[PDB]
């Protein structure tokens, strides 16, 4: 049934684009670049921007069971497609590390946390997701679907577990322990502020730096999983999955940006 | 008489208000604060 | 107490170097524009080098560009000047200027003593007209100066200075921005032009105001002073 | 004085675009004055540091380090020379701007009041009057530094202050609802102005020199002669309610430029108490206000550590 | 034209610079106040610093440094000065334990509990110090002790009945001080025994500051 399929593609793309729309709002309005963390969030809300970008060829494409487009252009939107995946991933790892130095090391944190050195950082994950991200380019082929084409299946495997290190793997392991150790010396803090009895505020921030990374596990993992499914299937998996994938990132204004009284103030 | 004291004003506001940039309209150029 | 003495005396011969020295008291050193400024003996001024507040903008006349090299020490107040590869047209006094740059300052205020050097043997052309004015004092004196392009800016000011050097001593500024004059000077000097002319006019002189006249302009790199008028009694 | 005045009426709209905008501080604005050449103004704020602003080209002249981080008021002389910065400590340390060195050196500290200082306001390179919160002024020196006339008629804090065309008589007005004219050659008021009801907060000159206005935290403005003393006219509107942090004139005296603490100025009719504009864009509370001598562009203070020029 | 512009470019981008590092060393100090009234004990918070207008106190503890402001004599309304300090750190309190029994020398009908507990409502609920922490301490234990064993402790409070220990009162009146603050959704009350024994209590306050801080940073992230 592809009726509640395509149903929940337009809910993904509307959802998302009234989220985003308010996120660049609430940002270029009221924050206008404060520091370095505002800087961040307006990465990731153009860079969901950029995500869909991409989000109206692949619900029409995924009705038409492969890519009538041509080839040309499928190389350049599956490019920007890998692009702005990295850079959301990219986005949220030093983030999490910009939190953590921030909280745990504040006189350190004074002279990274600049706005200087947050545009600075800010493109520079960008040519870096462009170094992961440019392999897509030397294997970039149409053969009607348009999907990567390798010439050894060794080669298609070192390749999909090189980006599940680099692009999930490694940055989940990050964002999990940038957290668990904000909350850990946060718990340190009350036990020596006489404070023994867990507060309401620490709740709050235990219950968010655990929502961020649970959903981003259940959101990316399926996605994930799947494609190691097409490495060696059923004609349904791949559809929802990327559907709640492509809900990650349109969940993620309302996610971040709305649960904190720092942008809806 | 404070009636008349208040109209004094009048030869103060209406006979400076040729200089005044704020309430008569003047031209971008001719003010230093250009863009 | 203002002062800028500097070290380094002693005649350098062709195919080394000098690296003279100057010091500065009296004032912080950290927030004002060093200039170099040359004299040969009875010849023009010529600025040299010019570096800024934290070592920032560093420029150099393309008669010293590439040969010469500054370097100031704001914890020493002390202003290095390494010279390689002289030559005799290098024999001058070597003026250090000091000066700070904002609206109603007074540019090139204090000058140093110097280090007269000896050598074992476009840009805007300030023109004066006249190197010598005889004149006893009895009567006003006014001299002028012209300019190779027109000093007349868009915010309003006109960025004109004019310099005496008494025989012995280093020269000192009198009129910055063609109008308004230095701390510690009389209201005598009088600075008047428009564009190119100018016009310095001197009310009553005194034994202070016998000297050798500059009109230096500050709108392009290298700066380029005046003539000279030197004045007899 | 509606019944005058048929003649005139609220010019439209009055809209002051935004031309300059003065970045660099970090805490929060609470002072600021001009001058007759209209480029050079001086800030002060919470984070101990006064900045002399070029008004044409939004650049910093000097940056002088204050001792005290609780500044509340400063003032720029008419010469240029010399600037003042009262707070908390009752330290008026009025700096020298033009000196032989590059730093800004102190010229002389005040530390003879012993309320807080709320405003301190220039006549001349001997003479400044300076305001504390002890519910008294006092006219001081700089070259010995002491209390030539100290004038103790108010039961309430004084708050602001503000120089006739001449210099030779001022009004002040205070916590309690209480404003004095105040002479300097005798050194005593000559009739109070009592027509509020709360704190007046900021008092400001006519140009004419025969009126003034007061700017109180009751949500309205009045404005006050010199002669016979009785209100004119009142700036009140349910439109309004919150206080008032800054009370200013024009050149010509019409617009009046009302700095209310509601994140936006106010640009009232002098003459008929019309809201004839409405300046918007400051992020917070405004706490100084002040218009130009040569008229062209109002600088308005909030505490966003941001400093908008109106033009 | 760029002839000396630049240069006056220059030197405003050199003190922008300048000005730059002041804030930041500014705000990685901790910056304090203290309030109380007449007879406040705040000769005990000034003393284990290491060192008209306002007296103000440097002290660096613990690789910190702190700023203390102390108000001491102002004869002025606060309602005009009190809106300056908004950005602190955590408002430092200091109220007297033997305050109870002792009425104010002004009028002879008001107590000096009474009277201070008016001030911590005044000081807490305003629209500036709603995020400010504030750490409130029981000066003269050891004088509070000494008297509860000789008065009903009721003279304050009339409508209490309970024990004249130290050890309950103490207890006691801090959830009564925890009683009058409205902001408890946003601001933190700390309470601590300082007197000249069992002395050094600057590390309750310094894990105090270091949670305010951290709070502030969590701002700075955008977590709350
Ligand atoms: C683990 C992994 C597998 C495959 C690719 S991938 O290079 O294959 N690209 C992704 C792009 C998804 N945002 C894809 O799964 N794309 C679909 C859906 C689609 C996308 C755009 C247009 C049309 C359709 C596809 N069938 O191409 C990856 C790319 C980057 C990082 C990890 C990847």
Redesign the pocket.
Known sequence: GMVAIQCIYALVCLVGLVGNALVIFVILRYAKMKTATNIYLLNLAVADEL?ML?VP??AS??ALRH?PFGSVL?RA??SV??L???TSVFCLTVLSVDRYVAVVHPLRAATYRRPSVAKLINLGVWLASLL??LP?AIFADTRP????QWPHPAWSAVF?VY??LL??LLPVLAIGLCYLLIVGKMRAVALRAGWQQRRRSEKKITRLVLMFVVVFVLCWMP??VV?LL?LFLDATV?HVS?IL??ANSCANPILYGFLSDNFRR | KVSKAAADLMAYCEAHAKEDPLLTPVPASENPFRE | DVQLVESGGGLVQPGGSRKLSCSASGFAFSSFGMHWVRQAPEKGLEWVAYISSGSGTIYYADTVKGRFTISRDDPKNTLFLQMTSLRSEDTAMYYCVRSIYYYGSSPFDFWGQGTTLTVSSSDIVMTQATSSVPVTPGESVSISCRSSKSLLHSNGNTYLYWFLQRPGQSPQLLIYRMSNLASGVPDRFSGSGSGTAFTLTISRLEAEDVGVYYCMQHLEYPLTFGAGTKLEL | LSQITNNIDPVGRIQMRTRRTLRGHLAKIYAMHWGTDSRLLVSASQDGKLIIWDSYTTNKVHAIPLRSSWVMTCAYAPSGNYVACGGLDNICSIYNLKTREGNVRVSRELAGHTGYLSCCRFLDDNQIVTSSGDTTCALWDIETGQQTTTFTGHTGDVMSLSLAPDTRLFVSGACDASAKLWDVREGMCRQTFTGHESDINAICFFPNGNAFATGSDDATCRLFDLRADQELMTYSHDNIICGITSVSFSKSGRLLLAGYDDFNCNVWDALKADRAGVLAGHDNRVSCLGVTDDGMAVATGSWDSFLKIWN | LSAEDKAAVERSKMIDRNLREDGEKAAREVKLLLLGAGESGKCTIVKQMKITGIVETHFTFKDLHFKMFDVTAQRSERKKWIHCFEGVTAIIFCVALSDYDLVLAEDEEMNRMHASMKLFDSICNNKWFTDTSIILFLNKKDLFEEKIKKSPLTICYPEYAGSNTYEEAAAYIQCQFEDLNKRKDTKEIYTHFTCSTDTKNVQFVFDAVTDVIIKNNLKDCGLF
């Open positions: 995500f991409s060829f692949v494409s995924a890519w499928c939107v599956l497609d890998g702005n995946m990295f992961v991200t897509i679907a348009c999907n990567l999909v980006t599940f692009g999930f996605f994930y494609q097409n791949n990327l994938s492509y």
